[PDB]
Structures are given as structure tokens and as C-alpha cells.
Amino acid sequence: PKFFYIKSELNGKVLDIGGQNPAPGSKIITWDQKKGPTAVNQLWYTDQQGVIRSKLNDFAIDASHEQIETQPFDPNNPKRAWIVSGNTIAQLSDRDNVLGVIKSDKGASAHICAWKQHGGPNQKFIIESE
Ligand SMILES: CC(=O)N[C@H]1[C@H]([C@H](O)[C@H](O)CO)O[C@@](OC[C@H]2O[C@@H](O[C@H]3[C@H](O)[C@@H](O)[C@H](O)O[C@@H]3CO)[C@H](O)[C@@H](O)[C@H]2O)(C(=O)O)C[C@@H]1O
Numbered sequence: 477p478k479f480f481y482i483k484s485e486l487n488g489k490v491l492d493i494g495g496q497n498p499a500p501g502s503k504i505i506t507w508d509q510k511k512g513p514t515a516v517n518q519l520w521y522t523d524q525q526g527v528i529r530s531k532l533n534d535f536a537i538d539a540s541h542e543q544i545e546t547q548p549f550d551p552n553n554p555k556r557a558w559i560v561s562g563n564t565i566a567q568l569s570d571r572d573n574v575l576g577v578i579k580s581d582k583g584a585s586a587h588i589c590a591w592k593q594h595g596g597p598n599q600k601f602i603i604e605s606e
Contacts, residue, residue, distance in 0.1 A: 478605075479519040479531050481509060482565060485600035486577045487586060493517040493546055494585070498533045504544045505585040506577055509604075519606060523549070526559045527568065537565070537575070539590040544575065555590075563600045564593065574599050 482491040489506035496517040510518055519531035528537055530546055536556040538547035550556055557568035558575065565575040572592060576599040579586045593599060 477521065479521050480606055481515075481518055481604040482520055482528075482560075483509065483602045483604055484577045484586075485563070485597040485602060487579070489586065490518050490604075491520070491588065491601075492585075493530060493532055496532065500535060500547050501541075501545050504537065504546060504588055506588070507585055515606075522560065525557075525568075527556075528558050528560065528565065539567075539575075543587040543589060560603055563602065565601055566593075575601070 484506050487506055490509045492505055492507035494503045494505050517532050520528050521531060522528055529535065529549065535546040536549035537558045538545050539555045547556055554569045558565050559568050561571060567573040567590065573590055574593050575588050575590050577586050578589055
């Protein structure tokens with residue numbers, strides 16, 4: 477219902493499920509903000525507890541692998557509980573661990589990782605209502 481974009485303060489692009497792939501394990505990148513029907517893979521919402529889910533498949537953000545990917549939500553997996561805290565997307569169980577944008581080294585789209593808060597814009601995001 478209440479959807480929003482998560483925009484990076486590093487490049488101005490938004491969290492986006494690469495190629496709108498609905499399958500679990502799909503990498504989340506930053507891509508030009510889209511508007512209209514096709515923007516679904518860039519739209520997110522928070523469940524009751526405040527955990528971020530994707531409008532595309534209701535999957536959560538997961539940081540179990542090298543780069544963040546979408547995965548079905550699991551209340552027992554600390555790596556799948558991410559919330560909006562100020563201008564940071566922080567881990568529910570560790571506010572010091574936050575998402576950050578890392579530009580591609582091979583001309584690809586930027587990807588996202590989770591690591592200790594270091595105050596730069598790469599770890600800052602703006603929540604934009606749909
Ligand atoms: C190898 C490759 O295909 N690289 C492209 C990359 C991949 O397709 C995705 O990472 C697969 O998950 O997508 C890039 O663009 C991202 C945007 O894709 C848009 O959809 C594309 C789709 O990805 C293309 O494969 C398809 O041919 O056209 C679709 C529509 O243009 C999404 O709509 C958009 O939100 C982004 O996710 C990328 O940079 O990752 C382009 C790579 O060349």
C-alpha cells in the first residue's frame with residue numbers, strides 16, 4: 477500500500493531489483509529512478525515491524541552473500557531484517573551495520589553491501605514517497 481523509493485545520496489539512483497527479476501537471490505543495484513507501472517522493482521514498503529520488503533514479491537533485503545540480494549523474509553535470520561533509521565538503512569539487530577552503495581568496477585550498475593557505519597554519503601539514503 478504505502479510504497480517508497482530508497483534513493484542513494486552517492487549517485488542519486490534508487491535501490492532496484494536488477495532486471496526486475498522476481499526470483500530470490502536476485503541482486504539489488506542502484507538504477508535511474510523510474511515512474512509509472514514499470515517502477516515496481518524500485519518500490520518498497522515496511523511490514524508491521526518496520527522491516528523493508530519489495531513491492532515486487534514482498535521479499536526482504538538480505539546481506540548473507542557478497543552483495544545484497546532479495547530473499548523471502550525470515551524472522552530468525554538477522555541478515556534479512558533491515559529498517560529505515562534516519563538517513564540510513566540499518567540492520568534491525570545492529571544499527572551500526574548499515575547498507576552502502578559501491579560503484580561497479582566493470583562498468584556495471586552500482587551494487588549494495590552492508591558494513592560498519594562510516595558517515596559518508598555512500599551509506600546515506602533518502603526515502604521518497606511513491
Ligand atoms: C548481463 C546483463 O543483462 N546486464 C544488464 C543488467 C541485467 O539484465 C540485470 O542485472 C539482470 O538482473 O541490467 C542492467 O539494467 C538494470 C535495469 O534493468 C531493467 O530491465 C531491463 C533488463 O535488465 C534487461 O535485461 C532487458 O533487456 O531490458 C529490461 C528493460 O530495459 C529494469 O527495468 C531496471 O529497473 C534495472 O534493473 C544493469 O545495469 O544491471 C543493464 C545490464 O546491461
